[PDB]
Amino acid sequence: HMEKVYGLIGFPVEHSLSPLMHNDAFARLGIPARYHLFSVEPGQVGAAIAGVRALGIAGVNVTIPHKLAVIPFLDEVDEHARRIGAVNTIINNDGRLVGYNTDGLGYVQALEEEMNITLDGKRSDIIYNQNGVGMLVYQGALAFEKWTGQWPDVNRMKQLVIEALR
Amino acid sequence: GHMEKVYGLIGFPVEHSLSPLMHNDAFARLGIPARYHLFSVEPGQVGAAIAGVRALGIAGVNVTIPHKLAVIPFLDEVDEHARRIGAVNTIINNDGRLVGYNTDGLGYVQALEEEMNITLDGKRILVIGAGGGARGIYFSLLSTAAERIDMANRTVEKAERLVREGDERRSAYFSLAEAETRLAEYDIIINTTSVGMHPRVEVQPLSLERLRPGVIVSDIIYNPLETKWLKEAKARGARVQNGVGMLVYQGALAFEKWTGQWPDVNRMKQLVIEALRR
Ligand SMILES: [Cl-]
Ligand SMILES: [Cl-]
Numbered sequence: 389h390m391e392k393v394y395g396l397i398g399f400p401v402e403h404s405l406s407p408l409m410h411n412d413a414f415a416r417l418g419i420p421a422r423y424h425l426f427s428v429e430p431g432q433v434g435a436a437i438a439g440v441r442a443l444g445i446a447g448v449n450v451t452i453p454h455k456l457a458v459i460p461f462l463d464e465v466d467e468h469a470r471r472i473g474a475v476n477t478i479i480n481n482d483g484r485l486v487g488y489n490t491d492g493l494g495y496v497q498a499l500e501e502e503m504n505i506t507l508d509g510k511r512s513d514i515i516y517n518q519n520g521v522g523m524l525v526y527q528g529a530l531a532f533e534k535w536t537g538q539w540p541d542v543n544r545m546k547q548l549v550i551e552a553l554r
Numbered sequence: 555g556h557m558e559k560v561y562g563l564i565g566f567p568v569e570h571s572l573s574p575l576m577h578n579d580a581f582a583r584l585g586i587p588a589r590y591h592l593f594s595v596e597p598g599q600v601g602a603a604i605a606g607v608r609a610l611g612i613a614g615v616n617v618t619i620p621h622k623l624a625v626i627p628f629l630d631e632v633d634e635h636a637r638r639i640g641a642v643n644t645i646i647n648n649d650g651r652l653v654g655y656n657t658d659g660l661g662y663v664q665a666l667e668e669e670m671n672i673t674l675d676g677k678r679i680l681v682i683g684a685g686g687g688a689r690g691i692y693f694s695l696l697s698t699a700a701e702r703i704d705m706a707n708r709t710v711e712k713a714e715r716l717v718r719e720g721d722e723r724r725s726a727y728f729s730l731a732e733a734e735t736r737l738a739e740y741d742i743i744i745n746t747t748s749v750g751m752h753p754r755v756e757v758q759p760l761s762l763e764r765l766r767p768g769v770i771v772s773d774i775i776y777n778p779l780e781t782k783w784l785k786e787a788k789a790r791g792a793r794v795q796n797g798v799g800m801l802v803y804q805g806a807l808a809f810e811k812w813t814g815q816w817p818d819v820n821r822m823k824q825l826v827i828e829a830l831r832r
Contacts, residue, residue, distance in 0.1 A: 390568075390569050390574075390592050391591065391592075393560075393591050393593075395610075397610075401557075402557045407555075407557075407558070408555060422589055422591070424558060424560050424589070425557045425558070426560075426610040426611055427611050428609055428610065428611070429609075432608070432609035433609075435605040435606065435608065435609035436606065436609035436610050438602045438605060438606065439602060439603065439605055439606015439607065439608075439609050439610050440606065440610075441602070442595060442599045442602035442603040442605075442606050443564070443593040443595065443603050443606050443607075443610075444593055444594050444595075445593075552555070
């Protein structure tokens with residue numbers, strides 16, 4: 389079968405662990421696809437996004453330093469991402485590119501699940517190299533769910549991440 | 555873990571390709587951090603796709619119908635052999651600079667010499683058809699020590715035009731009718747037309763009536779794995795070859811151009827044949 393293409397856009401991206409967790413998750417769920425790393429120099433972000441649409445790449449995550457840069461090139465941006473003024477997740481719907489930001493929701497969810505608490509109280513270090521691991525995994529999983537419609541096994545993603553960071 | 559490099563095919567359509575099958579298996583057997591994908595590119599979306607290749611850092615892509623001519627303006631450089639053919643089927647991305655090549659000719663030739671264990675020295679060759687699928691083969695054959703490379707085509711003027719681009723000292727142009735009458739004058743006969751290809755199988759590129767026994771009859775068609783033409787040639791005592799080899803060597807040459815390593819062609823043929831017989 390023809391696998392769909394996904395990946396991470398950023399500069400640098402070579403040491404990202406997103407491929408590790410996403411690819412294991414695709415396989416686990418029998419999803420014909422692969423997650424890659426796209427090193428995009430500042431100045432070519434416009435061409436990278438136009439490139440995503442033209443090549444039919446299914447979707448891409450966006451890390452430093454393009455979260456803000458990709459916005460003018462999308463066809464639609466989620467009100468939340470607009471407000472934040474940053475996008476870390478893009479999906480290509482038959483040519484229409486929509487931007488989302490799962491960094492926040494991801495931090496929150498990973499917090500209350502890893503700490504087993506509820507923010508309704510006063511209402512951790514995101515650096516993973518509480519860890520930022522939970523955040524890395526959850527923001528990715530939210531993106532994974534947007535693309536595939538399936539919520540991946542986060543415990544497995546965390547396990548692979550941690551093991552690698554060690 | 556290492557960053558996988560991205561390769562793929564651009565065209566419209568691309569889903570039928572066997573390149574992923576071949577390349578992904580080769581990357582695995584050789585321990586190469588990479589994957590070959592399929593990228594559908596609509597006519598008029600070529601400039602954006604190429605710009606994408608540069609921006610995203612895609613290592614290389616093959617090009618097929620109907621973009622082999624259309625991609626040229628977006629390339630920084632085009633190999634001399636590809637410029638002569640006027641089509642690019644292989645692009646390598648050298649850290650931002652795109653160079654195009656065409657593996658048609660060498661793919662065919664190298665597969666012929668190896669599969670049939672022969673040298674082209676002094677061979678009298680007849681190429682049938684004068685289309686894009688024949689230009690690479692024709693030009694590469696001219697670079698060998700073949701005795702002659704003649705060309706036959708239904709519309710003789712197209713063959714004449716191509717021969718003028720060639721030598722004219724070792725190559726003459728003929729109509730299919732003329733070619734059939736002098737079919738005995740050739741050591742190797744090559745069909746580059748799609749006559750006999752799926753689904754219109756019960757027809758042949760040209761009559762083998764005057765074919766000599768023991769000569770080589772080469773058909774680049776690989777679907778079916780044996781055209782009516784090849785079957786009859788075998789019956790007439792000819793050594794035969796379908797296009798599987800060309801397809802494979804086209805892939806191997808691009809693969810080597812990209813990685814610097816020559817893949818296992820027998821393994822590639824094995825997978826290809828299985829996919830075709832499926
Ligand atoms: Cl012409
Ligand atoms: Cl072929």
